[PDB]
Design a protein around this motif. Structure first.
Motif, PDB file in Angstrom:
ATOM      1  N   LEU A 118     -69.219  -0.039  -9.826  1.00 16.93           N
ATOM      2  CA  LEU A 118     -69.724   0.047 -11.192  1.00 16.93           C
ATOM      3  C   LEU A 118     -68.593   0.283 -12.184  1.00 16.93           C
ATOM      4  N   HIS A 119     -67.697   1.223 -11.876  1.00 18.37           N
ATOM      5  CA  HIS A 119     -66.644   1.559 -12.824  1.00 18.37           C
ATOM      6  C   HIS A 119     -65.627   0.438 -12.957  1.00 18.37           C
ATOM      7  N   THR A 120     -65.295  -0.248 -11.863  1.00 13.46           N
ATOM      8  CA  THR A 120     -64.419  -1.408 -11.966  1.00 13.46           C
ATOM      9  C   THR A 120     -65.062  -2.495 -12.812  1.00 13.46           C
ATOM     10  N   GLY A 121     -66.353  -2.751 -12.601  1.00 12.27           N
ATOM     11  CA  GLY A 121     -67.010  -3.772 -13.395  1.00 12.27           C
ATOM     12  C   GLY A 121     -67.007  -3.439 -14.875  1.00 12.27           C
ATOM     13  N   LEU A 122     -67.358  -2.196 -15.214  1.00 10.89           N
ATOM     14  CA  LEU A 122     -67.408  -1.811 -16.620  1.00 10.89           C
ATOM     15  C   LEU A 122     -66.018  -1.776 -17.245  1.00 10.89           C
ATOM     16  N   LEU A 123     -65.008  -1.348 -16.489  1.00 10.27           N
ATOM     17  CA  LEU A 123     -63.640  -1.408 -16.982  1.00 10.27           C
ATOM     18  C   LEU A 123     -63.243  -2.847 -17.275  1.00 10.27           C
ATOM     19  N   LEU A 124     -63.627  -3.771 -16.393  1.00  8.53           N
ATOM     20  CA  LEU A 124     -63.284  -5.172 -16.605  1.00  8.53           C
ATOM     21  C   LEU A 124     -63.990  -5.739 -17.831  1.00  8.53           C
ATOM     22  N   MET A 136     -76.421  -7.423  -9.205  1.00 12.85           N
ATOM     23  CA  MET A 136     -76.784  -6.492 -10.269  1.00 12.85           C
ATOM     24  C   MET A 136     -75.570  -6.153 -11.118  1.00 12.85           C
ATOM     25  N   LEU A 137     -74.425  -5.932 -10.471  1.00 13.58           N
ATOM     26  CA  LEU A 137     -73.195  -5.674 -11.205  1.00 13.58           C
ATOM     27  C   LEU A 137     -72.850  -6.849 -12.111  1.00 13.58           C
ATOM     28  N   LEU A 138     -72.961  -8.073 -11.591  1.00 16.65           N
ATOM     29  CA  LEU A 138     -72.622  -9.255 -12.378  1.00 16.65           C
ATOM     30  C   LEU A 138     -73.569  -9.426 -13.558  1.00 16.65           C
ATOM     31  N   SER A 139     -74.860  -9.166 -13.351  1.00 16.88           N
ATOM     32  CA  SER A 139     -75.811  -9.256 -14.451  1.00 16.88           C
ATOM     33  C   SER A 139     -75.493  -8.231 -15.530  1.00 16.88           C
ATOM     34  N   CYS A 140     -75.176  -6.998 -15.130  1.00 17.78           N
ATOM     35  CA  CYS A 140     -74.762  -5.991 -16.103  1.00 17.78           C
ATOM     36  C   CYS A 140     -73.496  -6.427 -16.834  1.00 17.78           C
ATOM     37  N   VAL A 162     -78.732 -16.437 -15.170  1.00 17.24           N
ATOM     38  CA  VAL A 162     -78.860 -17.019 -16.502  1.00 17.24           C
ATOM     39  C   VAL A 162     -80.164 -16.578 -17.145  1.00 17.24           C
ATOM     40  N   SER A 163     -81.220 -16.432 -16.343  1.00 17.66           N
ATOM     41  CA  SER A 163     -82.489 -15.955 -16.878  1.00 17.66           C
ATOM     42  C   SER A 163     -82.355 -14.539 -17.417  1.00 17.66           C
ATOM     43  N   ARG A 164     -81.699 -13.652 -16.666  1.00 22.04           N
ATOM     44  CA  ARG A 164     -81.496 -12.297 -17.177  1.00 22.04           C
ATOM     45  C   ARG A 164     -80.635 -12.299 -18.434  1.00 22.04           C
ATOM     46  N   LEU A 165     -79.563 -13.091 -18.454  1.00 24.82           N
ATOM     47  CA  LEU A 165     -78.706 -13.120 -19.636  1.00 24.82           C
ATOM     48  C   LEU A 165     -79.463 -13.635 -20.856  1.00 24.82           C
ATOM     49  N   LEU A 166     -80.247 -14.701 -20.688  1.00 22.43           N
ATOM     50  CA  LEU A 166     -81.046 -15.210 -21.795  1.00 22.43           C
ATOM     51  C   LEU A 166     -82.096 -14.197 -22.229  1.00 22.43           C
ATOM     52  N   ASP A 167     -82.654 -13.440 -21.282  1.00 25.20           N
ATOM     53  CA  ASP A 167     -83.573 -12.367 -21.639  1.00 25.20           C
ATOM     54  C   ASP A 167     -82.887 -11.338 -22.523  1.00 25.20           C
ATOM     55  N   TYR A 168     -81.656 -10.959 -22.174  1.00 23.96           N
ATOM     56  CA  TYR A 168     -80.930  -9.995 -22.992  1.00 23.96           C
ATOM     57  C   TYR A 168     -80.671 -10.527 -24.395  1.00 23.96           C
ATOM     58  N   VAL A 169     -80.671 -11.844 -24.570  1.00 19.30           N
ATOM     59  CA  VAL A 169     -80.445 -12.439 -25.881  1.00 19.30           C
ATOM     60  C   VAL A 169     -81.747 -12.448 -26.670  1.00 19.30           C
TER      61      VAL A 169
END
Length: 771
Positions: free
Chosen positions: A600-606, A643-647, A688-695
């Motif tokens: 999680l922390h590596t993903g958020l740092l990136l 889940m990490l990638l979607s976040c 892509v569905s989750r990302l479009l949902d966030y939009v």
């Protein structure tokens, strides 16, 4: 003659430490104060947590402590003078000026407190020659609560002397009117068999050669480096006393910092690291060059040795200090942390065994059961650390108040006090017997809203014989009681936990988790000594490190980098590193194989570093392709990584390239319709569905291929295909509880500063994570 001039054997070191231990003045001093200050009886002040059972050994507050409440008179805001006459002439160690400010304090008041002798602001100009502890800002003494605190008035002048004092409190509601309560205690130097002990302490204070020799013996640059760990502990006790008294020793510390940091945080145990952290906090608080930058330079010089550190609890204090001091030379800290993180992540990924991957995937277990070497153990910068170095303490309840009892609801079983009738503001107690006198080092009692306050008293022979108050937690209702690494660890056979029910509560039954107690069942000869007690009664290092040590280092480095970005030129650097290739390497190393927190922390740092870069969407699409294509034999937690990638994509969705690259990837995957990797199509479509949902032409192509896909069709994938088709069509525009024993020494403000450092680091990490 002088202990300062003799060789630093354990005997000389023991004597030098004895010359620094304190006691509370047994008979209470008399005091005269302005009329606006009205004394309150100590029994009333201690009514919530009575101390009367300690009266037989003068442990109650009525014997040494005075307390005055302020009445907001016409001039109560301005100068005040407390004249203080001691029962007898004595070697006074320090004066504890405790204070409580009104809760409705907007800003911390600017009040100077100074100590003088009886017969700059004008009163101090007239009494200039009698000043005994220069003007100390009231704010310097604040507890974590923000409106409370203590000033340990002390100085070399106070030590060089032996009946009356003045405490001058002047504000530079206004000023002193914001001071609701003051209290004063005096603490003398213990009675020692050492000859001319006053002259001995003077010699400790004046001689620079003494400080140089102390630093040399601490750094093991003397006597063939055969200085024992106990000798280093005694040397750090002496150094902490010197730093507290003085506020040239700073010059020696700055000249030998790199070695001091190395020896204390990388080659010693948790206790030595904590004592050195207290010493460095005192040095920080102390016309000389700033200490923070030099400490940063030393810490970053030693950073490369982190894979070779001895204990995790030692690394904890290193990183506490580094995180506090990073504000200087932010870019340098970022560079060092990034370099070490990149170096360590490669090895950590290389150390993943197939059985470990199977455990992570099939069962979600991220420990290394096949690697016997653990590095750190925590209980929960907000937790107990270095618990491998201490032993879990088993105890048996030997007495209880009323019908209360303990029940069970290698480590001791989780136990809790069941209380049948709690009432409100009702006192209940439980006495826990460790079976033998044990060396108590750490305590954790979880939060309990059922009670207003908790108090821990400790003794070995009897409560009335050698009873000591270990701690008073008033916020136990909202915060956990954590006593981490008691530096002068108490010796206790019996621990009385006294709980007071919540004010305004009649929850009939209560179940209070007793918590966890750590320490040593074997007390070493010098750890029970009545003396030395206050108030007696390079790449190969990475290659040879353990997996758990590397994981701990990665955790700390990721936290440091996240807080570095939060505190942000540090983003201008970390672009030469953590470019597309470096970002991909770090993700592959840490997010795929790492623990959930590391992932999680590596993903958020990136995201926070590269989330806004043009290549970021390409990075995410490449990661998706590489990790989820049907030809990938790599075993990893696909669900957690997804889940990490979607976040990651949701928090980087302001980058126009993210969805563009993912839709181009979907287009390439659906190209055969206009060879079909159905699982990759599923992963990409869900993401892509989750990302479009966030939009426009590219979107036409992708939606057309989605149409051919649904025309040429699993049923479950069809729902998301239709959702994504509609979303893409519409998306286009053209559609806190200190140990009470720190009061007796000079290490209470240092411990408060260390806790402040840890709390600020935790807050910064949380803010960075929750951007």
């Amino acid at each position: 003659d002088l202990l300062v001039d003799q060789p630093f054997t354990l005997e000389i070191l023991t004597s030098l430490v004895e010359l620094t231990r304190f006691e509370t003045l047994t008979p209470r001093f008399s005091a005269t104060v302005p009329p606006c200050w009205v004394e309150v009886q100590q029994e009333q002040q201690q009514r919530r947590h009575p101390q009367h059972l300690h009266q037989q050994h003068h442990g109650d507050a009525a014997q040494h402590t005075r307390t005055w409440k302020l009445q907001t008179d016409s001039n109560s805001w301005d100068e005040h003078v407390f004249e203080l006459v001691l029962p007898k002439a004595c070697m006074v160690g320090h004066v504890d000026f405790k204070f409580v400010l009104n809760s409705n304090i907007t800003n911390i008041p600017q009040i100077q407190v100074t100590l003088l002798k009886n017969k700059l602001c004008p009163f101090l100009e007239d009494h200039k020659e009698d000043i005994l502890c220069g003007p100390v800002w009231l704010a310097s003494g604040l507890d974590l609560s923000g409106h409370a605190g203590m000033l340990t008035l002390t100085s070399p002048k106070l030590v060089k002397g032996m009946r009356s004092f003045l405490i001058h409190v002047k504000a530079v509601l206004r000023g002193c009117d914001l001071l609701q309560e003051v209290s004063v205690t005096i603490r003398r130097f213990k009675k020692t068999s050492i000859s001319k002990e006053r002259v001995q302490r003077c010699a400790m204070l004046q001689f620079s050669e003494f400080h140089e020799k102390l630093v040399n013996t601490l750094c093991r640059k003397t006597d063939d480096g055969q200085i024992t760990e106990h000798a280093q502990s005694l040397v750090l006790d002496t150094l902490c006393w010197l730093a507290g008294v003085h506020s040239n020793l700073l010059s020696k510390t700055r000249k030998f910092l790199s070695d001091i940091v190395r020896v204390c945080f990388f080659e010693a145990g948790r206790s030595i690291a904590h004592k050195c952290a207290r010493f460095l906090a005192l040095c920080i608080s102390n016309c000389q060059p700033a200490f923070g930058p030099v400490l940063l330079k030393a810490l970053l010089d030693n950073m490369s040795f982190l894979p070779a550190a001895t204990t995790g609890g030692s690394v904890y204090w290193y990183f506490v200090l580094l995180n506090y001091v990073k504000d200087e030379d932010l870019a340098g800290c970022s560079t060092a942390c990034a370099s070490l993180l990149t170096a360590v992540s490669r090895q950590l990924q290389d150390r993943l065994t197939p059985m470990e991957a199977l455990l992570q995937t099939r069962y979600g277990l991220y420990s290394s059961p096949f690697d016997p070497v653990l590095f750190d153990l925590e209980m929960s910068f907000t937790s107990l650390t270095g618990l491998l170095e201490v032993e879990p303490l088993h105890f048996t309840c030997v007495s209880t108040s009323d019908g209360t009892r303990i029940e069970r609801d290698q480590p001791p079983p989780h136990q809790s006090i069941i209380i049948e009738r709690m009432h409100s503001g009702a006192r209940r107690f439980v006495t826990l017997d460790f079976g033998r006198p044990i060396l108590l080092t750490d305590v954790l009692i979880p939060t309990c809203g059922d009670l207003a306050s908790l108090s821990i008293d400790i003794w070995t022979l009897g409560e009335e014989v050698d009873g000591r108050r270990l701690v008073v937690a008033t916020d136990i209702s909202t915060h956990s009681l954590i006593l981490h690494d008691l530096i002068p660890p108490p010796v206790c056979r019996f621990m009385k936990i006294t709980v007071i029910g919540r004010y305004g509560s009649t929850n009939a039954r209560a179940k209070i988790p007793l918590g966890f107690y750590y320490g040593h069942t074997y007390i070493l000869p010098w750890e029970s000594e009545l003396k030395l007690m206050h108030d007696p009664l390079p790449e190969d290092l990475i290659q040879t490190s353990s997996t758990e040590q590397l994981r701990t280092i990665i955790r700390y480095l990721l936290d440091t980098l996240l807080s570095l970005l939060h505190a942000s030129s540090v983003p201008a650097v970390l672009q030469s590193t953590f470019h597309a290739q470096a970002c991909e390497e770090l993700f592959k190393h840490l997010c795929i194989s790492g623990t959930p927190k590391i992932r999680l922390h590596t993903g958020l740092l990136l995201v926070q570093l590269c989330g806004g870069e043009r290549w970021w969407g390409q990075f995410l699409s490449n990661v998706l392709q590489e990790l989820y294509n049907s030809e990938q034999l790599l075993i990893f937690p696909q669900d957690r990584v997804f889940m990490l990638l979607s976040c990651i994509g949701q928090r980087s969705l302001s980058n126009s390239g993210v969805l563009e690259s993912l839709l181009n990837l979907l287009d390439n995957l659906l190209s055969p319709l206009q060879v079909l990797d159905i699982p990759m199509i599923s992963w990409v479509v869900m993401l892509v569905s989750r990302l479009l949902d966030y939009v426009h032409e590219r979107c036409i192509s992708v939606v057309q291929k989605l149409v051919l896909f649904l025309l040429s069709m699993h049923a479950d994938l069809l729902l998301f295909v239709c959702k994504v088709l509609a979303r893409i069509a519409n998306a286009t525009r053209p559609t806190q509880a200190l140990d009470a024993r720190l009061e007796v020494g000079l290490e209470q403000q240092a411990e408060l500063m260390l806790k402040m450092m840890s709390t600020l680091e935790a807050d910064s990490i949380l803010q960075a994570l929750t951007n």
